[PDB]
Design a protein around this ligand. Structure first.
Ligand SMILES: [Mg+2]
Ligand SMILES: [Mg+2]
Ligand SMILES: [Mg+2]
Ligand SMILES: [Mg+2]
Ligand SMILES: [Mg+2]
Ligand SMILES: [Mg+2]
Ligand SMILES: [Mg+2]
Ligand SMILES: [Mg+2]
Ligand SMILES: [Mg+2]
Ligand SMILES: [Mg+2]
Ligand SMILES: [Mg+2]
Ligand SMILES: [Mg+2]
Ligand SMILES: [Mg+2]
Ligand SMILES: [Mg+2]
Ligand SMILES: [Mg+2]
Ligand SMILES: [Mg+2]
Ligand SMILES: [Mg+2]
Ligand SMILES: [Mg+2]
Ligand SMILES: [Mg+2]
Ligand SMILES: [Mg+2]
Ligand SMILES: [Mg+2]
Ligand SMILES: [Mg+2]
Ligand SMILES: [Mg+2]
Ligand SMILES: [Mg+2]
Ligand SMILES: [Mg+2]
Ligand SMILES: [Mg+2]
Ligand SMILES: [Mg+2]
Ligand SMILES: [Mg+2]
Ligand SMILES: [Mg+2]
Ligand SMILES: [Mg+2]
Ligand SMILES: [Mg+2]
Ligand SMILES: [Mg+2]
Ligand SMILES: [Mg+2]
Ligand SMILES: [Mg+2]
Ligand SMILES: [Mg+2]
Ligand SMILES: [Mg+2]
Ligand SMILES: [Mg+2]
Ligand SMILES: [Mg+2]
Ligand SMILES: [Mg+2]
Ligand SMILES: [Mg+2]
Ligand SMILES: [Mg+2]
Ligand SMILES: [Mg+2]
Ligand SMILES: [Mg+2]
Ligand SMILES: [Mg+2]
Ligand SMILES: [Mg+2]
Ligand SMILES: [Mg+2]
Ligand SMILES: [Mg+2]
Ligand SMILES: [Mg+2]
Ligand SMILES: [Mg+2]
Ligand SMILES: [Zn+2]
Lengths: 205, 159, 104, 56
RNA sequence: AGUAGCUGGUUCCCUCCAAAGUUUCCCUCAGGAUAGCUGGCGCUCUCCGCAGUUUUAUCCGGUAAAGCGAAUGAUUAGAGGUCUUGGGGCCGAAACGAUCUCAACCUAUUCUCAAACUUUAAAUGGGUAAGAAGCCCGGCUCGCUGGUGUGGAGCCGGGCGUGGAAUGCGAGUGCCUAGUGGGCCACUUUUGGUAAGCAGAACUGGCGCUGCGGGAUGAACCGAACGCCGGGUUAAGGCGCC
RNA sequence: UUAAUUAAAACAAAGCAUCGCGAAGGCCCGCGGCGGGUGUUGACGCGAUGUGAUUUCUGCCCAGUGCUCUGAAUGUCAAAGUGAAGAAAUUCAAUGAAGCGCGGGUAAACGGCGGGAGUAACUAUGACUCUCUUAAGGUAGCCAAAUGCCUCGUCAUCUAA
RNA sequence: ACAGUGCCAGGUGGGGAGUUUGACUGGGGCGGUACACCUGUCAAACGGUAACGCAGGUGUCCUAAGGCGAGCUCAGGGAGGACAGAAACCUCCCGUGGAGCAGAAGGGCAAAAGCUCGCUUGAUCUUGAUUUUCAGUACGAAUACAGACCGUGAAAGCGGGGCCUCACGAUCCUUCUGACCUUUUGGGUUUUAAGCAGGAGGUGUCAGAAAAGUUACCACAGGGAUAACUGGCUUGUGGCGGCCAAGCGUUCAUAGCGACGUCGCUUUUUGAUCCUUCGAUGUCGGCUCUUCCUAUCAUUGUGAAGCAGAAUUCACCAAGCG
RNA sequence: GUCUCCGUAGUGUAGCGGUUAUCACGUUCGCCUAACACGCGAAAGGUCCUCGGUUCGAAACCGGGCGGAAACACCA
RNA sequence: GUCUACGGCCAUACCACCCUGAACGCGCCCGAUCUCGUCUGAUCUCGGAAGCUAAGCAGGGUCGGGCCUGGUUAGUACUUGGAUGGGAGACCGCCUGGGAAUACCGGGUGCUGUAGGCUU
């Protein structure tokens, strides 16, 4: 139904968002970016692996949907439906056009919206998985399988940050002990030595 | 093609800076402009009268006429292979005294004094500027501290 | 466009602002003995058919309204033409606008 | 048929063959375009310059 | 000897200089006029001026990047409040009584974005200045301005050469003027298109107009530009044999 | 019948049907006239068209475009003529030929001749009904016809196909 | 006294004459207007910059929506108040503009440029200079002044149209307005006519001819600047083939298949483009004849099956022979 | 494909920027008739296809959709 | 130390809340005969001087929000010029120069001109 993904692999056009100028864009193939036990607290899943893009290219919303299912099914089978949390880190905002031929030719060749893609840079995280530290093997295998749904080269990388947080795993526990970090569900709020001293009193009372 | 509109492409050029809209400070209107002065042209979108044309925004000219509200400026404009001395009428909101010559006038006064003062003291002083010379030989004391050894760091995939 | 039937404007004969009667200008009927109409008649006579262009491709849908001013000074009565912009609807001394009224 | 539409290629090469000469500068510029009221008095100032000739 | 904005042809040598396929207007699109690019003839001076350059000062800017716990727009996930509004429940005599529960809402966070968003904000870039047409004194004219013999401009006389960054270079100026007005290619940037030895732009440089060494071969690549010669040395490329 | 790429289903034809004209006329020629052809003619004739033997039949539409008929009753309407103003040039008014407008006729004149929905006791159709609608809304016939896109329509016959 | 003829006048008059029947354009036509203009973007931080590039607008509207002055403050929200409720009107508070300013958009604007009142006609008369497009021409539009008459305000001041960026038109001709105007030919008076200056009547193909078709009966000058074959680049579409493995296969992913995805190859499909050929490369199909490819239907030699045999399916070397 | 046009009670249809959204049929209630039809007197019932916008007020006017129907598509 | 009138720059000056304000001021404040204007002496205008710093206003405070300014981000991203560099490409590295911005961390919290007062 759609052209082979080699036709829209490269970031050749400027970003083309669905806006008030580009009307008629069909809905993206991927509508869910978080799945698994999304409600696990920050402290339940210390491990985090990433699928990191090694190329500057465009991924179709179809391949994001395909990879998500691929990585999600393998985790449900090797860790259980409540043993992980998957977050797809790319959103298909750039719109790809089509100049449909059956005949004007190249006259009036500007194309109609055909789909959506995510523009991914080198070193940019495609999708992330957080789970328990004893499932590190199953995370790598899930992301290794999902690579086959994407064009180009992607690298797997087990992060040093605690879960989906921005704070290193080697010190995350210490910061929570002294109330520099406050769990707020999947993540942690950061407490600076700033602001009204009342907020400090509340945290220490 | 494009349009020949007078203010095409001035969306940002003539807009006011961030959180600097509103009333125009009155010192803008208290400046004294004299024939021969050098002024930098800068269109201000708050006042739409006497607006300089976009091609003159960011150019520097010379005042030749002074009226109640505006001045006449002789400003070079390049059109293709020739440069034309153009005469524009610009309300004094859209100009400011150029400080490019002030450094020169400061130097002239300093030059003349040194020229005058040194003459009565029978000495030759330098007056002409010079380009920065290569730095002269010098000693670097170590203060009994071995220079810190530097090494390249290992690669890490901090992705 | 709505224009008052009077306006105090400049009179060239008087050299000072004066009240003026305002009316719309209307082209007068063509003279048969104007040099241009006399030359045309002689050229259009005999054989040869039409000799001048006849304009067909009309594009404008309105005209510039010219107001005929007259000085109301009994001694001066000087007149002047005063053209305004294009308008599809033009009237003299129509009902003046009212604000804060219920429109029925 | 269709042809090229516009370009400025080769144009800065032609402009510089005879140099992009700056406008000529004279020590006396024309009073064209200066304020008519101020020019009227300047003419009057010049017109009676000879009145104070002996004093000078 | 009809006219032809169209096809074809247009006859000796050497020397010197040497283009354009671009601007605007045209029933203009296979053509003209126009500016540009060219040539010729000079002339006014010279043995201060100028510059496809940097330096030093000083302005101009909103692209690259970045931002979205900053405005606009788009957008993922949980978390804490919640009666200020609803869906379900749910004990009733029943109410804003009790009870949860899911939603909207609000508050802090969180994922991801913009050619027609932006608080920030480069590099490269554009303008100006770097003196004698300057600086500093005394005076005079005014019908302009005016509390003021104030202001401004103009004019007269006088005094100051360490000619006030680097570098390079002789400059200025005027007539007459042909051809051209189908272009095309490459690095980078860039629009449309799946792409194209595709169509359309910016910058510079090329081919066209140009041979020569290398790329076996080749309009454009790499090196390098050319009077007729000898010797020497090289470039880019090479050194089994051809 | 296209001499020299088309011999035909094309043209003609008898038959049929219109139309103009009674001679100072119809139709036509001619630069010209007491000019000329039809015409040495006279409506069973001459002139202008369509269809195309016979057989059978030739339905509806005059709104459109044509053609035609009636006209001071009568809007517009040239020159010339008439009247008034003026020094005159000139201007103005009154009057009002044909033709156009107005009203009839005419299709063997050019031509034209619908759409939607519901409805019969299985289903299907739908004689029947409702509705919008035009100047008529395609009648008798005929048809995948030299005329039907879909289409190599569907059924039957002709073949092993 | 009409026919008729001579000369004028009105109608009819493709019977006949002459002529026209735009341009751009991924060939032309059809379609659009990228033909005169304006906003944002493209556009690569001065300016400029193309495409039948993208998102839009214009041929108007306004006696006030122009001008001045004064006085106010808007969208939205919160909380209160008979009927009154989501929504009527009153009150208090918050409110950087989240409103409004004729319109497209962008910019600008808070004791205002918005809203409401009061007075008004600077939308008037006039000579030059300048800017924008630019050839440094015209128009159009705009900017500073200058000279008169004015309005408004207590006044400073502001105003010669609309907050800024668009909203428009030469020559010739016609019409109007102006002067104790010039000429009206030998002089004078007077009608007329012509001059001079400023408006309007319009050219939207918008620097401005007056303009319908058809040609298969066709013609000339050209064009490979340009379409209809081949060939060339490309390969979207077509064809063929891999990779991952959710499923299918009773069981069992992979004997045989294979979704969601993804990577390729081919030029026996169609496109896209217009490089060669228009002083001509004979345009479909069949027939005949040779040759070549392999992506193998058969045959030879093989491997694997959900291969008992038979039949079949998948795969290998393989184009010798059909 | 380009261009033009159309969506209103159950059906077919009017609407001349401010309507009690027109007409006919249909449905319902009551008379009439032994009953039916015809007929007479009444009643009800429009998601103005949908979203946005101008307007003091949009069924209408202007745009974006959702379905529908015409006209073209030629020279090889 | 500080205020009043008029200002320049226009948040280091703003916003929220709390504390403190001698003197003179600036105010709140008391009235409507006159001037003037309102549905309303609320505002505006006019005539005053019983009271009060309650508020405005001034100074200060807040591990305050904002704002200003540094650090980090980082010689990172981006970039001028170069190569017969790599790679099928996408892109990337190096040579020669220039060189950012968040988050995060710190510091600051109006200066000042003219005139005239108060403060032994
Ligand atoms: Mg592109
Ligand atoms: Mg005649
Ligand atoms: Mg050209
Ligand atoms: Mg000849
Ligand atoms: Mg000849
Ligand atoms: Mg030609
Ligand atoms: Mg023309
Ligand atoms: Mg040629
Ligand atoms: Mg820009
Ligand atoms: Mg960016
Ligand atoms: Mg090209
Ligand atoms: Mg050539
Ligand atoms: Mg050359
Ligand atoms: Mg060469
Ligand atoms: Mg080679
Ligand atoms: Mg040699
Ligand atoms: Mg023959
Ligand atoms: Mg024959
Ligand atoms: Mg007939
Ligand atoms: Mg018949
Ligand atoms: Mg008829
Ligand atoms: Mg028919
Ligand atoms: Mg029938
Ligand atoms: Mg038959
Ligand atoms: Mg048959
Ligand atoms: Mg005729
Ligand atoms: Mg003819
Ligand atoms: Mg053409
Ligand atoms: Mg640039
Ligand atoms: Mg005001
Ligand atoms: Mg004036
Ligand atoms: Mg206004
Ligand atoms: Mg006489
Ligand atoms: Mg034919
Ligand atoms: Mg033909
Ligand atoms: Mg060609
Ligand atoms: Mg082809
Ligand atoms: Mg394919
Ligand atoms: Mg199974
Ligand atoms: Mg080409
Ligand atoms: Mg040949
Ligand atoms: Mg041959
Ligand atoms: Mg041949
Ligand atoms: Mg094989
Ligand atoms: Mg006290
Ligand atoms: Mg009071
Ligand atoms: Mg207090
Ligand atoms: Mg703070
Ligand atoms: Mg302070
Ligand atoms: Zn008068």
């Amino acid at each position: 139904g759609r052209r082979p993904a080699r036709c829209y692999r490269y970031c050749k056009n400027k970003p083309y968002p669905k806006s008030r100028f580009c009307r008629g864009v069909p809905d993206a193939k991927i509508r869910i970016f978080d799945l698994g036990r999304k409600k696990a607290k920050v402290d339940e899943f210390p491990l985090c692996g990433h699928m990191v893009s090694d190329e500057y290219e465009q991924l179709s919303s179809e391949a994001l949907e395909a990879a998500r299912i691929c990585a999600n099914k393998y985790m449900v089978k090797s860790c259980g439906k409540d043993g992980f949390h998957i977050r797809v880190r790319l959103h298909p905002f750039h719109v790809i056009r089509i100049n449909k031929m059956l005949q004007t030719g190249m006259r009036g060749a500007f194309g109609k919206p055909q789909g959506t893609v995510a523009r991914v840079h080198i070193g940019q995280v495609i999708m992330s998985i957080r789970t328990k530290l004893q499932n590190k093997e199953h995370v790598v295998e899930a992301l290794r399988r999902a690579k086959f749904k994407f064009p180009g080269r992607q690298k797997i990388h087990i992060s040093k940050k605690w879960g989906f947080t921005k704070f290193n795993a080697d010190e995350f526990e210490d910061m929570v002990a002294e109330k520099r970090l406050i769990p707020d569900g999947c993540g942690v709020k950061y407490i600076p030595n700033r602001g009204p001293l009342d907020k400090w009193r509340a945290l220490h009372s | 093609t494009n349009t020949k509109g007078k203010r095409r492409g001035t969306r940002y050029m003539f807009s006011r800076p961030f959180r600097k809209h509103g009333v125009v400070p009155l010192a803008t209107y208290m400046r004294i402009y004299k024939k021969g002065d050098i002024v930098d042209i800068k269109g201000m979108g708050t006042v739409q009268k006497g607006m300089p044309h976009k091609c003159y925004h960011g150019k520097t000219g010379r005042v030749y006429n002074v009226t109640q509200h505006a001045v006449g400026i002789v400003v070079n404009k390049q059109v293709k292979g020739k440069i034309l001395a153009k005469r524009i009428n610009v309300r004094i909101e859209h100009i400011k005294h150029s400080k490019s010559r002030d450094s020169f006038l400061k130097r002239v006064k300093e030059n003349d004094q040194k020229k005058k003062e040194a003459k009565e003291k029978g000495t030759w002083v330098q007056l002409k500027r010079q380009p920065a010379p290569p730095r002269e030989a010098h000693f670097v004391r170590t203060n009994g501290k071995e220079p810190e050894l530097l090494e390249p760091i290992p690669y890490e995939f901090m992705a | 466009v709505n224009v008052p039937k009077t306006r105090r404007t400049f009179c060239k004969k008087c050299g000072k602002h004066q009240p003026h009667k305002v009316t719309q200008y209307k082209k007068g009927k063509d003279s048969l003995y104007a040099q241009g109409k006399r030359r045309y008649d002689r050229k259009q006579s005999g054989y040869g058919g039409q000799t001048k262009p006849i304009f067909r491709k009309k594009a404008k849908t309105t005209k510039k309204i010219v107001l005929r001013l007259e000085c109301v000074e009994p001694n001066c009565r000087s007149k002047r033409m005063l053209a305004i912009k294009r308008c599809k609807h033009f009237e003299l001394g129509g009902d003046k606008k009212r604000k804060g009224q219920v429109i029925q | 048929a269709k042809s090229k539409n516009h370009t400025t290629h080769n144009q800065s090469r032609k402009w510089h063959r005879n140099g992009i000469k700056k406008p000529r500068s004279q020590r006396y510029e024309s009073l064209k375009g200066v304020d008519p009221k101020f020019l009227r008095n300047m003419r009057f100032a010049k017109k009676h310059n000879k009145k104070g000739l002996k004093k000078m």
